[PDB]
Design a protein around this ligand. Structure first.
Ligand SMILES: Nc1ncnc2c1ncn2[C@@H]1O[C@H](COP(=O)(O)OP(=O)(O)OP(=O)(O)O)[C@@H](O)[C@H]1O
Ligand SMILES: O=C(O)C[C@@H](Cc1nc2cc(Cl)cc(Cl)c2[nH]1)c1ccc(Cl)cc1
Ligand SMILES: O=C(O)C[C@H](Cc1nc2cc(Cl)cc(Cl)c2[nH]1)c1ccc(Cl)cc1
Ligand SMILES: [Cl-]
Ligand SMILES: [Cl-]
Ligand SMILES: [Cl-]
Ligand SMILES: [Cl-]
Ligand SMILES: [Cl-]
Ligand SMILES: [Mg+2]
Length: 284
């Protein structure tokens, strides 16, 4: 079991509402980690215990190159510590903001990596539920590292669970089924995927308004459109993901899963095997 004094801490990488992620070097190995640190007092007082336990449980199940890895956990009197892989190039969102619109090849490359990651996650019976560019980090080689699993859900194989009842997510990316039936499912992540593809090309996600309530209203009416020059194969894919009926989204279980999704013409050029070993196109 590791201890705080086993590390030298460097710069703060980011701060959440109830967490702080700091860059750290382990003295005995010289390895770098992003260590996420939570104050026990704050977690208890503010009803966050279930989210911390959830995050640990979900991440412990993950063993795929496109996800942040949880290497170890420890605690002292005041704090809990998650030792995570360090994604040196930060959030995908920052690149979307800087560049405004990814070209087709960069759009396809990152879409493909997200699809690959979702194939794995859903194959393990896990829903992310808060997929968004802020939660898609980038490692030193510019491959994705998906993060933020405190609001993910492990669906129970014992009961053949398909639906989850917790209300979680981010307004711009939240699915219509969560807003109207008050449940999410694997296909809810595919809705978010469609929002993300759209945003890579269009700069802003599809359902656009200045507060959460206005966005909710647009989502349930499928109120959005495409800017000019939106790559046609990408547009077709988005239209097959942003479908109000969650059982009709390309990639969902009722549509026979990821095979048909990976077969979409948008991914014609993609070699899905060893995707994480391919050199990524330059953003930038
Ligand atoms: N493994 C990592 N490598 C590099 N940076 C990270 C890593 N994990 C998190 N960060 C950065 O630290 C910031 C805070 O992450 P954390 O999950 O602790 O809180 P959050 O989810 O951003 O905040 P909130 O809880 O309010 O949603 C993130 O915005 C991210 O940019
Ligand atoms: O396996 C371990 O190392 C201990 C566990 C158990 C654990 N102890 C806790 C104390 C508090 Cl105050 C809150 C939570 Cl969510 C707690 N979870 C633990 C440690 C660290 C982290 Cl980040 C999560 C869970
Ligand atoms: O999507 C983000 O959260 C990143 C930011 C800020 C931003 N996000 C928005 C989402 C919506 Cl729905 C609407 C507006 Cl006006 C929004 N402004 C942003 C601004 C400009 C550009 Cl080109 C890209 C991203
Ligand atoms: Cl940037
Ligand atoms: Cl929401
Ligand atoms: Cl549902
Ligand atoms: Cl097409
Ligand atoms: Cl892969
Ligand atoms: Mg988080």
């Amino acid at each position: 079991k590791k201890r705080p004094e086993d590390f030298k801490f460097g710069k703060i990488l980011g701060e959440g509402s109830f967490s702080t992620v700091v860059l750290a070097r382990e003295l005995a190995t010289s390895r770098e980690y992003a260590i996420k640190i939570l104050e026990k007092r704050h977690i208890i007082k503010e009803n966050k215990v279930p989210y911390v336990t959830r995050e640990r449980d979900v991440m412990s199940r993950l063993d795929h190159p496109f996800f942040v890895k949880l290497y170890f956990t420890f605690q002292d009197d005041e704090k809990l510590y998650f030792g995570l892989s360090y994604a040196k190039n930060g959030e995908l969102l920052k690149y979307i903001r800087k560049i405004g619109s990814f070209d087709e090849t960069c759009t396809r490359f990152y879409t493909a990596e997200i699809v690959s990651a979702l194939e794995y996650l859903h194959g393990k019976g896990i829903i992310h539920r808060d997929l968004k560019p802020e939660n898609i980090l980038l490692n030193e080689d510019m491959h994705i590292q998906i993060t933020d699993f405190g609001t993910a859900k492990v669906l129970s194989p014992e009961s053949k669970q398909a639906r989850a009842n917790s209300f979680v997510g981010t307004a711009q990316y939240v699915s219509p089924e969560l807003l109207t039936e008050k449940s999410a499912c694997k296909s809810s992540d595919l809705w978010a995927l469609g929002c993300i593809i759209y945003q890579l090309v269009a700069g802003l996600p599809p359902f656009r308004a200045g507060n959460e309530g206005l966005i909710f209203a647009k989502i349930i009416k499928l109120e959005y459109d495409f800017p000019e020059k939106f790559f046609p194969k990408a547009r077709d894919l988005v239209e097959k993901l942003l479908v109000l009926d969650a059982t009709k989204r390309l990639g969902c279980e009722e549509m026979e899963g990821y095979g048909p999704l990976k077969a979409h013409p948008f991914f014609e050029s993609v070699t899905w095997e060893n995707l994480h070993q391919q050199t990524p196109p330059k953003l930038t």
